[PDB]
Amino acid sequence: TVLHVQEIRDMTPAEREAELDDLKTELLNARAVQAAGGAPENPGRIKELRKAIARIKTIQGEEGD
Amino acid sequence: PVYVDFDVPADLEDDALEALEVARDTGAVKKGTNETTKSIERGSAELVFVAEDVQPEEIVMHIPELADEKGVPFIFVEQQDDLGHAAGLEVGSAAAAVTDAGEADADVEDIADKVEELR
Amino acid sequence: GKKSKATKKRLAKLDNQNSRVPAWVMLKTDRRNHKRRHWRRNDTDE
Amino acid sequence: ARSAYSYIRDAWENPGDGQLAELQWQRQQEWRNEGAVERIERPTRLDKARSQGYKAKQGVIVARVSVRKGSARKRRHKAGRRSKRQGVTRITRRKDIQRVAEERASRTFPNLRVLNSYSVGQDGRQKWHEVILIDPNHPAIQNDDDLSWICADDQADRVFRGLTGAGRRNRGLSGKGKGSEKTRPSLRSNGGKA
């Protein structure tokens, strides 16, 4: 959602990787909030983060990095 | 070994190969057991060479007797690859035949003679 | 007994499968865990 | 004129006479000390090999195989049998020894395919055959007009299905007329009565 494919392709190889580490962190913090039984969740994003990461990873392979 | 009934001195073998090398540059020579065999049969052969390290032996076992009943003289060489080199080949040759020498008839004649004596 | 790491993973899975069909599945399907096992009454593999 | 090849041939019409006799007596001593399957650089019977399709080329291999002489090495029935099915001693197998030799050679060279084979004698307790095998994956063969046919997928493991010359003969396929009612097109299609 929030992150579209164009934007990902418009990023440089360095931006994708930085963007990747950033998304992985948001995800890790979400799973931590969930593990803590935290309710301030948003089940949609925790799901979106996974897809976004798959997209970036898919784009990284396509562009050669 | 089973077809070799006499041993040829390293020196006699030397003269023969030299005579064979000058035979290809001057006269005519046959390379290979088949071509050699036909030469003997057609009688167009003066001197035939036969390697002694041929395996299987069946390839050349016939040369000796076929040569005798055709009056064609023959001589043994120890190495298969030398005969092939002397014959001008990049490989080996189980048998060879000098089909009419060339500026070597003298030597080739002596060799044949030296062999008959060698029995 | 002495369980290996893998044996332990398999036992763990079996334990997990032993949970019940969540309440919401009932409402959603508008109305049983057939693979309900008991440590004593049943016998797992291995 | 006669080919030199004809002389190897003529020698082998009577392996027990002449020089060939002495060669065999000498050779078998070494053969008896070799293994079941020995790859050899050159055919012992050149005329026969070339005649069967052999060529001095890359991808062409020759191997000598030895097999025990005699009938079937069978175990006596451990259960009930009518007198008819109690035999042991006079029972012989349905594949000739040459065929057994071809298969052993082929098993030794899994990637190669049997092209043909021929006999090179025997002593009192074993028989030797030489087998020609071809490398279907070597380009020198894939480009040969006389051998490239053996590269086809359906020629894989041909020996094990009886597609060899020795195989076809042993299957009673030599005759095109009388006598081949139960052999052609296959022993199996004819209910195994051939």
Next chain:
Amino acid sequence: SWDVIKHPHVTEKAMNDMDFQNKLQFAVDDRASKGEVADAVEEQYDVTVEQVNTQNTMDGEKKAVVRLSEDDDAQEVASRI
């Protein structure tokens, strides 16, 4: 490429280990070693790891008990997530 840290293991026992022994507990990939768990933890929260104890759990996962140096404060670290 599997990651080392899966998520913080938060339970009554974990909290005590955090308040009383300056230890943090994590659910980690069972293929991860004590060393790989130490490194990962330092690189994720910028802290110094003193000791790591592990346990393959009856949940099919690996639990890690990570003690931080007196220089760091577990309570504060875990509180920012």
Next chain:
RNA sequence: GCACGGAGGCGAAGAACCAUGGAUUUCCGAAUGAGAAUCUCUAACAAUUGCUUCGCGCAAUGAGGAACCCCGAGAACUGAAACAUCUCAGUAUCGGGAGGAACAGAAAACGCAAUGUGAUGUCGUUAGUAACCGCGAGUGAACGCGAUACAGCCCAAACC
């Protein structure tokens, strides 16, 4: 998703869904660095082969598939109103192996004997005929003919 829940999210930046192509594709598994009840230990075509730059450098094999197919091993109950040859049956089952189909196949054929046919399967028929057989019970073709489909070639050697 099955699956009609709660919460929440995605979709006009055209989602869902469908077709084609691509990405990702843990561990064990022929399982192949060594070992192991799916894990572990210290760079790997393990093993057998072909080629070979003789170095795993280039390649092959292995295992699977409903049956069908080819090559080998091969019963007994049963029938004969007993039973041994015979029968059940080259069946059941076993070993090995290929393909999309296999196998066969261009006559050292046939032998309606001919001034005739003309590779090979298969189908119909020839026929329960010829032949076999404690001449018992039973077993059992072929040539030909009518069809289907059709297609003929390559080596070894001679001479080079």
Next chain:
RNA sequence: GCUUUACUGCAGGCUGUCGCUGAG
């Protein structure tokens, strides 16, 4: 299932012969 100088066979052992197998 078991027995035996029941019927018929089958392993196995002994023995001759042929091949392996040659010279005087």
